[PDB]
């Protein structure tokens, strides 16, 4: 059964960019995940209504591990291609952000996914 | 002899505790000298007036709630007036008129 | 509209009740 | 523990015992901060 909309959404995007893409269920996390992926420029029905050569791979992380601020270094070192390219996506007490402002907003929290 | 520690009782689940030491003096119990007056050297050097038996008693203005068998031991709350002191500890019987 | 008490004070419960 | 006085090792033998590119380069006998730099970078 459909457990995570975010997991289904990002896999739909990757397979299309590997090959515009459509996401049938839209949530409060799916869209505002994209606003992070759009401010990095990577991306250009009454029932939870329903790409520019830059996205390499966007994926979610299974259970959203609480991330301390000190723990940021371990996650980036694992899930990011380099120290200058990718971006995590964090859900924190002040909205869904990435490793840049969440390091600057001085907060931690759970981790959604990433995109190279 | 008589100890008062919970190292020999069971657990709330019914488990049997296992011995890890021997009886320690801080759990001392004493033989109950029923008051049908001695002194006992308790810990820290204080004295306990152990009234073995006694008949007179100060009072201020036939039945034992705990054990009917006691009916002529003298204990607190016993009816004779109702005793209010601890004769086995204080060494005297102080009671009040019902 | 309180910080996010029963469901009789929540926004779409009271703002509909207000409506 | 065994002793209050501290002690340390002042060397470390190589992992690979025999390698020609090391025998020549090293040739009385054959008897830290880089990572410290690393952690702040």
């Amino acid at each position: 059964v459909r457990v995570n909309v975010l997991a289904d959404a990002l896999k739909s995007i990757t397979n299309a960019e590997k090959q515009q893409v459509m996401i049938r269920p839209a949530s409060k996390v799916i869209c505002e995940f994209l606003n992070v992926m759009m401010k990095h420029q990577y991306i250009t029905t009454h029932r939870s209504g329903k790409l520019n050569g830059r996205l390499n791979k966007c994926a979610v992380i299974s259970p959203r591990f609480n991330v301390t601020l000190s723990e940021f270094d371990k996650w980036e070192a694992n899930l990011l291609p380099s120290r200058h390219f990718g971006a995590l996506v964090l859900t924190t007490s002040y909205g869904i952000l990435d490793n840049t402002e969440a390091r600057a907003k001085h907060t931690g929290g759970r981790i959604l996914g990433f995109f190279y | 002899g008589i100890t008062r520690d919970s190292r020999h009782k069971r657990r709330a689940t019914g488990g049997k505790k296992n011995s890890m030491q021997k009886k320690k003096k801080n759990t001392m119990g004493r033989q109950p000298a029923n008051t049908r007056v001695h002194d006992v050297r308790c810990r820290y050097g204080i004295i306990k007036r152990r009234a073995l038996r006694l008949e007179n008693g100060n009072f201020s203005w036939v039945y034992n709630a705990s054990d009917n068998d006691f009916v002529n031991t003298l204990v607190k709350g016993a009816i004779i007036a109702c005793i209010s002191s601890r004769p086995g500890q204080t060494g005297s019987v102080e009671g009040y008129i019902l | 509209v309180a910080h996010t008490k029963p469901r009789s004070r929540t926004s779409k419960a009271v703002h509909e009740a207000y409506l | 523990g065994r002793c209050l006085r501290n002690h340390s090792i002042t060397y470390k033998t190589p992992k690979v015992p025999y390698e020609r590119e090391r025998f020549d380069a090293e040739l009385k006998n054959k008897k830290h901060m880089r990572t410290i730099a690393k952690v702040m970078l």
Binding site: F65 | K9, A65, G77 | - | -
Partner: protein
């Protein structure tokens, strides 16, 4: 209440005090005829440092109930939690009559009252009925 071999009496006989940090004495405590030597509000037993909560698991015991606590235990290696529970026996004064199994109760730590009982019910909140209205 005088259904036992001794004339039950209060502790400060001449009585109702109040518990400390932000609590309210229940109504049934004052007007209630019950004589309880271990009642927090109508006796000489106080509530010291610790203060816990939980749901009530059993209401069969005389003047005593069982509180169930559920929590989590983070495990380092797997970076995940596991559900765990602990049950503690809490003395409950007759000042609470509507209290039944499945309700949520704020408790406080008092002196050793029995082999297992060391806490006292302070404030209770009832929940939905678990098909069995089992009270103290």
């Amino acid at each position: 209440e005088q259904t036992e071999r001794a004339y039950q009496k209060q502790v400060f006989h001449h009585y109702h005090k109040q518990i400390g940090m932000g609590f309210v004495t229940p109504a049934e405590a004052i007007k209630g005829t019950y004589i309880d030597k271990k009642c927090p509000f109508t006796s000489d037993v106080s509530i010291r440092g610790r203060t816990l909560s939980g749901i009530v698991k059993s209401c069969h015991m005389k003047r005593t109930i069982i509180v169930r606590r559920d929590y989590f235990h983070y495990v380092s290696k797997y970076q995940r939690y596991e559900k765990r529970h602990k049950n503690i026996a809490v003395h409950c004064s007759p000042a609470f009559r509507q209290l039944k199994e499945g309700d949520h109760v704020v408790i406080g730590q008092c002196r050793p009252l029995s082999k297992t009982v060391r806490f006292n019910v302070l404030k209770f909140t009832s929940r939905g009925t678990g098909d069995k209205k089992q009270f103290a």
